[PDB]
Each structure stands twice: as structure tokens, then as C-alpha cells.
């Protein structure tokens, strides 16, 4: 009653309701799926039908040539957070002339996201990000939360009804590290399809695919480009 | 620095401090402006004369520039901040454009300032409305009205203050091209509209008329009784 309006107020249970309510903002957005093999890292997202006449969203963003993100939650907090991530990746290539490592970008997010969770009159970033990457250490599926810790994932899905995808992903995660590129994306499409109503299916108009790889920069795939990936599902 | 959101939204999408600043306008003295063919007439309704006013310094029709003059209703102290900040902008515009302002320019400056205190931290909105009259360089007369929300519209005739719901109902049934034809008949259109709102009646109003170059002059008290006797 009186412990949920401010982010600087602990409840008597050792718990901050304003942080947990911002994590409710990412569980009611749209389902996005991220997963990786030993060679690639794939972000698949549902471009959500706002109406029957809207070109739906854009929910996968370019960050660097080796890192792209996928958005669940408030979209204006996302690109406010993505413009920080784009600047932090330009900051390294200007200074070190090398790609900034994926595990160090997400550590800069979680230290920038923790700061509004502790000062008065500031709100948590109501956005979850699945982050695909290819560093010198391989592929990476970092998930970040409004509760500013982050998670190196083998595969992860966030958004509305995304537990059905995590039910799917945790079953078939035993075979992700030995897939082809077209085989790995189709696992993410079958995970993304699990988050759909029974009257709905994965068209080419509502699916974006973001792939990053070894000899492949990060690319998003539009409506006509997801047709070679949906040709088997 | 006092940084706290004073004007916030409410359920059903209302800004309470903007709505409550408009209730401060409705508790103020009634101001009427109509727009003629080559004449704009502002008239305010002095509620009390009291025989002890130095009336020179509670006049509610100011003069923003030589071509622009306004009349307000609402919190008198909030108006004097708006009147003075419009007068500074009318002089900065002569500095940079080498031309007098248009009436819609200083209306946009007053409205965007009034919008700014509905959205900045640590500020309440202005509790005034402003009937702004003037003339372009082309000579077209203008009549504008700003609200505490920061919204401004052009008007053929308008009324702000107390009783303005009844004065605007009067002017919407009596503003025609025939009553806006003669310059003296335009002046009696404000005086007829004010006398419907002045609950005590008589020569207890203030009224200023601005024609073209050889500009604005506020009418004297015996020069206003000549019109009120011509409408008795």
C-alpha cells in the first residue's frame, strides 16, 4: 500500500516493488526469443499487431557490427538504452579500434540501469533486452532485466507468454551447439510460435530475425527476407 | 532548485493545475474584446470603483507595443509578469527583424510561455487569460485569446472573466457586419456586452480602443458615459 510508489523504499520483506513492477512491464510486451550455437547467435521477435493496418514495430536494433538487441517492454526506454549502447560501442572503436566485447557491454548496461533503481524520483528502465553478439569468445545471448542484473544465457525468451518458449527452449537446448545457421533459426521460430494464440501463426509480416556470426556482421531480416527461414516450419 | 512536478496528469486525462488556473480566470473581472473592420476595442469590467482608487495603475488593458495591446482576466500579479515578458519580446523582435511584431507572433510567445509553466518543474500555471488585439503591417485587425493551458485562438469577438459564458452568448447573437461597420458602433458593442455582466450597472467600466497609426488611447470616464447615454 505504502511501499510501492518509490524505488528508494524497501518493503518489510526485503523487496522493492517499483523494481518488480518494471519487470511486469517486460512480461507484458511482446515475445522475443534469443539463442546461440557454437557459431551464430539468433534473435527472433514478434512484430506485434497493434492494429490490422500498422507496419507492426521494429523490435530488433543494430547496436554494432557484432552486437544487436531485441526489445521487450517500453520501446522508448529501449532506444534510450540502445543509444547508450551504440555510443558505448563507438567509444571503444574510437579508442581501442577493436569491437567492444559483448560481456563488457552488458556490464555497462547493468551499472547504468542500477543507478535509477537507487535514487529518489527516478524510475527503473522498464525494458528487457535480449542481446546477441559475437566477441572473440564466441556467441552470446545476454538477457538484461529492469532489476539491473543480467544473465548469460544459452537461450532465452522474454515478453508476453514467453514461458511457453522457455518450456520449448529448455527441451531442445541440448542440441543447439551443433546446429547449422538455418537449423538454429528454425528452433527460434518454433520457440516464438509457442507464444502465439491458437488463431495466430508466424507470417512473414510479423517476424523479424537478427543474426550475428563469425564471418557475418549483425543483420536484421525484413518481411521478404524471413521467407527462406519460414520455408520449413 | 525546486524541481517538483506541480502540473501532473490525473485519471480521465486532466491536468488539475491547468483546470484550477482556469477557475482563477473565471473569478476575475470580465474583459471583452471585439474586432471591427479597422478598429479593435478592448473593454474590462471594473467590479468596484470605491472612490479611493488611483485608477491609473489598476488598468487591465496594457500596451505590449505600439501596435499590440492586451487585456487580461485572472490573477492580476500573474498578468504583470506576462505583460512585461511580452514587452521584452516585442522589443527583441524589433531588434532582430527591423519590423514591429504581428499580433499572432506575440500571441504565440505568450501562449508558449503559458504552456511552459504547465509542463516545467516547480511552477504553477499562470492564472490568467489574455485578450490580445492589434494590427498587422497590412492593416488587418487581429483579436486573439490565450488560455492558461497555452492554447490560443483567433476570434471575431471574445469574452473572458466572470460571466463570460453569458457575454459570449450575447456576442454570438449580436456580432454582425452591420454592428462592426461604424467605428463608434463597434465601441458600443463592447459596452452593451459589458452592461449585461456588470451586476451594479453604470459607468463603472474601463475601455480602450486602438485604431491604426495614431495608435492606442484608453477612453476617459466622461467619454465613456457619452456612449452609455447613447444606448440608454
Amino acid at each position: 500500500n505504502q511501499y510501492d510508489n518509490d524505488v528508494t523504499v524497501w518493503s518489510p520483506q526485503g523487496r522493492i516493488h517499483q523494481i518488480e513492477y518494471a519487470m511486469e512491464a517486460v512480461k507484458q510486451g511482446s515475445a522475443t526469443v534469443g539463442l546461440k550455437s557454437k557459431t551464430h547467435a539468433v534473435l527472433v521477435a514478434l512484430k506485434r499487431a497493434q492494429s490490422e493496418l500498422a507496419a507492426h514495430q521494429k523490435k530488433i536494433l543494430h547496436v554494432d557490427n557484432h552486437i544487436g538487441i531485441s526489445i521487450a517492454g517500453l520501446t522508448a526506454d529501449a532506444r534510450l538504452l540502445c543509444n547508450f549502447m551504440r555510443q558505448e560501442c563507438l567509444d571503444s572503436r574510437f579508442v581501442f579500434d577493436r569491437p567492444l566485447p559483448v560481456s563488457r557491454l552488458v556490464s555497462l548496461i547493468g551499472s547504468k540501469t542500477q543507478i535509477p533503481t537507487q535514487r529518489y524520483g527516478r524510475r527503473p528502465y522498464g525494458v528487457g533486452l535480449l542481446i546477441a553478439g559475437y566477441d572473440d569468445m564466441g556467441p552470446h545471448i545476454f538477457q538484461t532485466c529492469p532489476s539491473a542484473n543480467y544473465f548469460d544465457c544459452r537461450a532465452m525468451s522474454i515478453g508476453a507468454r514467453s514461458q511457453s518458449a522457455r518450456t520449448y527452449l529448455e527441451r531442445h537446448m541440448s542440441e543447439f551447439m551443433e546446429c547449422n545457421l538455418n537449423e538454429l533459426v528454425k528452433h527460434g521460430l518454433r520457440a516464438l510460435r509457442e507464444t502465439l494464440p491458437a488463431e495466430q501463426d508466424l507470417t512473414t509480416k510479423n517476424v523479424s530475425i537478427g543474426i550475428v556470426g563469425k564471418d557475418l556482421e549483425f543483420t536484421i531480416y525484413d518481411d521478404d527476407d524471413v521467407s527462406p527461414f519460414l520455408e520449413g516450419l | 532548485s525546486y524541481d517538483r512536478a506541480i502540473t501532473v496528469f490525473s485519471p480521465d486525462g486532466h491536468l488539475f493545475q491547468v483546470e484550477y488556473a482556469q477557475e482563477a480566470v473565471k473569478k476575475g473581472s470580465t474583459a471583452v474584446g471585439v474586432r471591427g473592420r479597422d478598429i479593435v476595442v478592448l473593454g474590462v469590467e471594473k467590479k468596484s470603483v470605491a472612490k479611493l482608487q488611483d485608477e491609473r495603475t489598476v488598468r487591465k488593458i496594457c500596451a505590449l507595443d505600439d501596435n499590440v495591446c492586451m487585456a487580461f482576466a485572472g490573477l492580476t500579479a500573474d498578468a504583470r509578469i506576462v505583460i512585461n515578458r511580452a514587452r521584452v519580446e516585442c522589443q527583441s523582435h524589433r531588434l532582430t527583424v527591423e519590423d514591429p511584431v504581428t499580433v499572432e507572433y506575440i500571441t504565440r510567445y505568450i501562449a508558449s510561455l503559458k504552456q511552459r509553466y504547465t509542463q516545467s518543474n516547480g511552477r504553477r500555471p499562470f492564472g490568467i487569460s489574455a485578450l490580445i488585439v492589434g494590427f498587422d503591417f497590412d492593416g488587418t485587425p487581429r483579436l486573439y485569446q490565450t488560455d492558461p493551458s497555452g492554447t490560443y485562438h483567433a476570434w471575431k469577438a471574445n469574452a473572458i472573466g466572470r460571466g463570460a459564458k453569458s457575454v459570449r452568448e450575447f456576442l454570438e447573437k449580436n456580432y454582425t457586419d452591420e454592428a462592426i461597420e461604424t467605428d463608434d458602433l463597434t465601441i458600443k458593442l463592447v459596452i452593451k456586452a459589458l452592461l449585461e455582466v456588470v451586476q451594479s450597472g453604470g459607468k463603472n467600466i474601463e475601455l480602450a480602443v486602438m485604431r491604426r497609426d495614431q495608435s492606442l488611447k484608453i477612453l476617459n470616464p466622461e467619454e465613456i458615459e457619452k456612449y452609455v447615454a447613447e444606448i440608454e
Binding site: - | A63, L64, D65, N84, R87, V88, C90, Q91, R94, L95
Partner: protein, 196 residues
């Protein structure tokens, strides 16, 4: 250098200025107003560095016009000259000083005619007659010679004409035309340009 001259009479503040806007060797403009009216009854005659003479004079003009809007009455010439001195003096040690040499002239309904001198080092002085520029050297002794404090305004134009004929014969710059205007009690009247 450009040329200013003012002659205070009993009820007028006759001023004149050259109308040239010279550059390196060529001159650009031959009808150049160096007079800036501030009220209905006061003028500011401004010469000096390039650009400073309008960035200062229009700044003084916009605040003296703002004074009339805020208050309903105009400044006096003494208060306008003192206002003009303040924001010329507190900027002479700033990052951006103004190198303007001024000649403020005005009529007051109760104090009368008033002519003011000030230089780029912001020293205000009320004078019966004053002049600026290199041409002041040749003309301030025409005016120490034939000026009386009770001079008519017809004899002030005729005394002004003696000073401007002295510049035609003895001064090396080409200053052919001069804007001349009076500041009697009825405001500012543009007299005919004394040309050569």
C-alpha cells in the same frame, strides 16, 4: 573617421553627422544614417568601430523603448545618457567592449535642451556643443569662436554650415553630405541635408 557635431541652443539641440560608410580605400555608402532615435525627443549619434555602432545603439534603443512601454512615459535625456553610460562603462572591462564614440542629444519638457558627449572610455559630459572624429579638430574652434548660448536656430544652421565648409577645405577625407536635424520641443525634425 566619421564625423559628429551637436550644437545646443536655448530650445533646440541641432545635431549633424556625415553620411559616409567607408572601407579601406573605397567607400561603400553615400547616404548613411548615423543617428538613432530613441524616444520622440532624444537622438543617439554613434560613430566608432565597425559593428559596435549598431550593436550598442540598437541595444540602447531597445531598452529606452522598453522603458516607455513598461512605464507610460519616456526617459529624460539626462537619464538616457546616464543609462547609455552604464552599459558602456561596465562592458569596457568585459570580454567584449564597444569602441563607440557617442553624441546623445535630446529635449526635456522641464529641463530643456541637452547635449551629451561620451567617448569609448565611457566618460559622460554635458556640453553646449561637442563633436567627434578627426574633423572635430578643425571644427571645435569654429564653435569656440561664433557660438553664443543665445544663438538662434537659423544662426545655428549657419554656424553648422561654417564647420562643414571647414571640412571641405582643410580636412583630407571626402565628407560631401551631412544629415542635419533639430530637436526642439515638438520632437525631431529632419532638416535639409547640407551637401557639397
Amino acid at each position: 573617421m566619421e564625423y559628429l557635431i551637436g550644437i545646443q541652443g536655448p530650445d533646440y539641440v541641432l545635431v549633424a553627422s556625415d553620411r559616409v560608410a567607408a572601407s579601406n580605400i573605397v567607400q561603400m555608402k553615400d547616404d548613411h544614417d548615423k543617428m538613432f532615435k530613441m524616444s520622440e525627443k532624444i537622438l543617439l549619434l554613434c560613430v566608432g568601430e565597425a559593428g559596435d555602432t549598431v550593436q550598442f545603439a540598437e541595444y540602447i534603443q531597445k531598452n529606452v523603448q522598453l522603458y516607455k512601454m513598461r512605464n507610460g512615459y519616456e526617459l529624460s535625456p539626462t537619464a538616457a545618457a546616464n543609462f547609455t553610460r552604464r552599459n558602456l562603462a561596465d562592458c569596457l572591462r568585459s570580454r567584449t567592449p564597444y569602441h563607440v564614440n557617442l553624441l546623445l542629444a535630446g529635449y526635456d519638457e522641464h529641463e530643456g535642451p541637452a547635449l551629451y558627449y561620451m567617448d569609448y572610455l565611457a566618460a559622460l559630459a554635458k556640453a553646449p556643443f561637442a563633436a567627434h572624429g578627426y574633423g572635430a579638430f578643425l571644427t571645435l574652434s569654429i564653435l569656440d569662436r561664433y557660438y553664443t548660448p543665445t544663438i538662434s536656430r537659423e544662426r545655428a544652421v549657419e554656424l553648422l554650415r561654417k564647420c562643414l565648409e571647414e571640412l571641405q577645405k582643410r580636412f583630407i577625407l571626402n565628407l560631401p553630405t551631412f544629415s542635419v536635424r533639430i530637436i526642439d520641443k515638438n520632437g525631431i525634425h529632419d532638416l535639409d541635408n547640407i551637401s557639397f
